[PDB]
Amino acid sequence: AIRKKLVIVGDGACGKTCLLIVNSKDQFPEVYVPTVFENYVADIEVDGKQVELALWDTAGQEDYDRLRPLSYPDTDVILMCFSIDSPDSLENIPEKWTPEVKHFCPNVPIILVGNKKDLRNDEHTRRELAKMKQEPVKPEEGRDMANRIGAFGYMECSPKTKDGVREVFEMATRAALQA
Ligand SMILES: Nc1nc2c(ncn2[C@@H]2O[C@H](COP(=O)(O)OP(=O)(O)O)[C@@H](O)[C@H]2O)c(=O)[nH]1
Ligand SMILES: [Mg+2]
């Protein structure tokens, strides 16, 4: 079986840990974990061959900036996340996450992931953003950002509803196999 390492990065509260949990497990207890602290793998078949993906979670808050690069050695694919309910998290993609990953993971493919797709049409989300004259991220803004940062692709998903999640890991596997 082919062995590849995936790392997930992005602002806090954007759904990173949930994305890793929903694709790897059938049940998760009632506990909040900042990062997956157990060895989670994704077993994916692509083009008629079996790939095993080690999934490495990170903490996006600034207090962790100094220790986060311990997760980067020998990465084969990056999932770089923002949340569709947070325009601020999208702004941090070119400003923080892109230069950090390009430094520690040179030439490693990046999948830009717009998480929490279910909140784009959520009434409560729309009201909370609207009160500050904001709105959910539009798909065209994510495509534009993937062009700006040189990502391998842009995908949207919801760890909550599961929509789009399998496709994220399949494209990440395809990307990891190119090099
Ligand atoms: N509505 C919605 N909430 C989500 C989704 N994914 C995660 N969440 C919630 O967002 C919060 C943060 O998720 P988490 O995975 O801990 O984010 P992380 O800080 O990036 O690891 C939690 O309350 C999750 O239950 C989603 O697709 N839709
Ligand atoms: Mg987390």
UniProtKB/Swiss-Prot annotation:
There is a cross-link at K133 (Glycyl lysine isopeptide (Lys-Gly) (interchain with G-Cter in ubiquitin)). Glycans are attached at Y32, T35. This is Transforming protein RhoA. A motif (Effector region) lies at residues 32-40. It is found in: Cell membrane; Cytoplasm, Cytoskeleton; Cleavage furrow; Cytoplasm, Cell cortex. It catalyses: GTP + H2O = GDP + phosphate + H(+). Changing Y32F: Abolishes AMPylation by Haemophilus IbpA. (Microbial infection) The basic-rich region is essential for yopT recognition and cleavage. It is linked to Ectodermal dysplasia with facial dysmorphism and acral, ocular, and brain anomalies: A neuroectodermal syndrome characterized by linear hypopigmentation, alopecia, apparently asymptomatic leukoencephalopathy, and facial, ocular, dental and acral anomalies. Patients show no intellectual or neurologic impairment.
